[PDB]
Structure 1
Amino acid sequence: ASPDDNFSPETLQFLRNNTGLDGEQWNNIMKLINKPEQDDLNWIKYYGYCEDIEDERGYTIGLFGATTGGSRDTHPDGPDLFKAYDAAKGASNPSADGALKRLGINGKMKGSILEIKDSEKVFCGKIKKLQNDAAWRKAMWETFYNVYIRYSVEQARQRGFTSAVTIGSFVDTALNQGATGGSDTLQGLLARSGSSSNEKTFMKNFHAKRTLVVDTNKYNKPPNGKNRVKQWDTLVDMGKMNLKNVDSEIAQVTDWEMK
């Protein structure tokens, strides 16, 4: 195992200081999130994930579904990811354009979208190469943090909850259904989850409310949604809230067929 190698030295310091969780805990969280997202526990392979999913959002890249932008995604997070990479590489005036230049990618920021001129073969080929680039891993995590993790950690701390299971479950919810906005988002679900000060009770309630909307086709293909939340709820029932020394348990709860 040795979860630490799945990150980078600087990334672990960042995650520990801002989320209070360590390498093993984040590694376990990622296994649980990657199962319903890519049906693959080997999540580090997705640092270099790049693909045009023909959904009019440009290219989908990385671990958390960031896109480069398209007619149907005019507020993508991809530009932020690239700017973060430029920053991680030391740019004093970091920018998505600076990042593309460093990478030798023929593309530019057009408005709030990234306009890529290279073919998918060329573009994604370059992204694939970044899988073990420490700066790319750092940029990936910083962006994942700004888009979904920060808010999830804030919601947990507001309620006096700091467990790995709670944070991981909130993050899975935000990533899959959105952080804020409608009743189906992390924000919306929390508003309907009660006010129990007992972490286990609260999470059992939260998971029950999430199960009602998780299988709506737009979020997951049934019964994948029900199964993804079941993973977290099971850990709560087993009392494995700290997500440390749970390799066999994780192997057991992710043992389910997608679709």
Structure 2
Amino acid sequence: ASPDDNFSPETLQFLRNNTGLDGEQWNNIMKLINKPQQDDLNWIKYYGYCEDIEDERGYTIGLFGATTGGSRDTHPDGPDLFKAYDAAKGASNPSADGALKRLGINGKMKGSILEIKDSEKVFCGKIKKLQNDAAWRKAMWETFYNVYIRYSVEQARQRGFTSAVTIGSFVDTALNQGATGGSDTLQGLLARSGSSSNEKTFMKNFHAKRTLVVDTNKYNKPPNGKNRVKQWDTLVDMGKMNLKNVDSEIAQVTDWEMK
């Protein structure tokens, strides 16, 4: 089948118009993101993913591991995901509070965190049932774009970089470690990575800076973070910057055991 078939028509077109990348390229980026999040490449199965992974971020949800919030993530992306779901369901004044009411979940915003009073079995049971919900899937792509992809593509383009590998690597860093804010976010790592106009030189240095922190602060369990960055770095070394006609290379660089 065509890799394009893994996206809604609206998402396929929006990603092409706003990121320059096609369905094969985005499908490949998603395979590469999904490996360290779920230990497989079948990303389309994970819209309804929900789990408390005990990392002090609350519950982790969906394709990009949106979090509801906790002591290790006090500016989480999960509230925006829920607000976007409320909006996609037709709410006149969409909000995270409203999405949880709609879903029959006992929870609400407390500051910038979503406080969930339901048990994990109850909360995650309701989220799992959204796997095939069109409004949820729409909200999930809208939020992925708004929080991580738009900023990542802006940062690539401002350096003259447009390749699928560079955008993918920036997007993986942003969703894993945060887009903006602290030293380990995409913004913070870009600040440490210098000003080379050569895409290969720049990305090799960026990957090296990311490798120093990717297995810290519970972003990943070591050596899973080191291996996730190695995926992108190996693709740069291989010169496969466009992520087209790379099925065997993706199978190779994702061939690492998850701890």
Could you tell me the TM-score, scaled by structure 1's length?
0.89
Contact kept? 2:55, 2:218, Cα under 8 Å: no
Contact kept? 2:83, 2:99, Cα under 8 Å: yes
Contact kept? 2:32, 2:41, Cα under 8 Å: yes
| Displacement of 1:232 | 0.8
Contact kept? 1:7, 1:137, Cα under 8 Å: no
What residue is the counterpart of 2:195 in the other structure?
Answer: 195
| Displacement of 1:248 | 1.4
What residue is the counterpart of 1:118 in the other structure?
Answer: 118
**Which stretches in structure 2 are left out of the alignment for 5+ residues?**
none
| Displacement of 1:39 | 1.4
Name the SS for the 1:114 alignment partner.
strand
Supply the distance in 2 between the matched residues of 1:57 and 1:215 (Cα, whole angstroms). 16
**156-165 vs 139-148, greater mean Cα deviation:** 139-148
Contact kept? 1:47, 1:137, Cα under 8 Å: yes
Q: Cα deviations across residues 112-150 of structure 1 (Å, max 9, x unaligned)? A: 333334332232122111112222111111111222212
Q: Cα deviations across residues 81-131 of structure 1 (Å, max 9, x unaligned)? A: 111012122323212233223333343334433333433223212211111
Structure 1 residues 191 and 116, CA, compared in 2 at 3 Å: closer, same or farther?
A: closer
Structure 1 residues 71 and 205, CA, compared in 2 at 3 Å: closer, same or farther?
A: closer
Supply the distance in 2 between the matched residues of 1:185 and 1:96 (Cα, whole angstroms). 24
How many residues are matched?
Answer: 259
Structure 1 residues 54 and 238, CA, compared in 2 at 3 Å: closer, same or farther?
A: closer
Contact kept? 1:195, 1:202, Cα under 8 Å: yes
Supply the distance in 2 between the matched residues of 1:34 and 1:193 (Cα, whole angstroms). 25
**Which stretches in structure 1 are left out of the alignment for 5+ residues?**
none
Structure 1 residues 212 and 110, CA, compared in 2 at 3 Å: closer, same or farther?
A: closer
Percentage of matched positions with identical amino acids: 100
What residue is the counterpart of 1:21 in the other structure?
Answer: 21
Q: Cα deviations across residues 200-237 of structure 1 (Å, max 9, x unaligned)? A: 22212222332233333633333222221111111112
Q: Cα deviations across residues 69-90 of structure 1 (Å, max 9, x unaligned)? A: 3455443322211110121223
Contact kept? 1:60, 1:68, Cα under 8 Å: yes
Contact kept? 1:34, 1:40, Cα under 8 Å: yes
Name the SS for the 1:109 alignment partner.
strand
Contact kept? 1:148, 1:171, Cα under 8 Å: yes
The alignment status of 1:33 with 2:33, answered yes or no, reads yes
CA RMSD across the alignment: 2.2
Contact kept? 1:8, 1:134, Cα under 8 Å: no
What residue is the counterpart of 2:63 in the other structure?
Answer: 63
**179-188 vs 85-94, greater mean Cα deviation:** 179-188
What residue is the counterpart of 1:233 in the other structure?
Answer: 233
**115-124 vs 22-31, greater mean Cα deviation:** 115-124
Structure 1 residues 44 and 91, CA, compared in 2 at 3 Å: closer, same or farther?
A: same
Could you tell me the TM-score, scaled by structure 2's length?
0.89
Name the SS for the 2:108 alignment partner.
strand
Contact kept? 1:44, 1:131, Cα under 8 Å: no
Structure 1 residues 172 and 136, CA, compared in 2 at 3 Å: closer, same or farther?
A: same
Structure 1 residues 97 and 243, CA, compared in 2 at 3 Å: closer, same or farther?
A: same
**7-16 vs 241-250, greater mean Cα deviation:** 7-16
Structure 1 residues 183 and 3, CA, compared in 2 at 3 Å: closer, same or farther?
A: same
**242-251 vs 195-204, greater mean Cα deviation:** 195-204
| Displacement of 1:238 | 1.7
What residue is the counterpart of 1:170 in the other structure?
Answer: 170
Contact kept? 1:11, 1:137, Cα under 8 Å: no
**99-108 vs 132-141, greater mean Cα deviation:** 99-108
What residue is the counterpart of 1:91 in the other structure?
Answer: 91
| Displacement of 1:258 | 1.7
**190-199 vs 231-240, greater mean Cα deviation:** 190-199
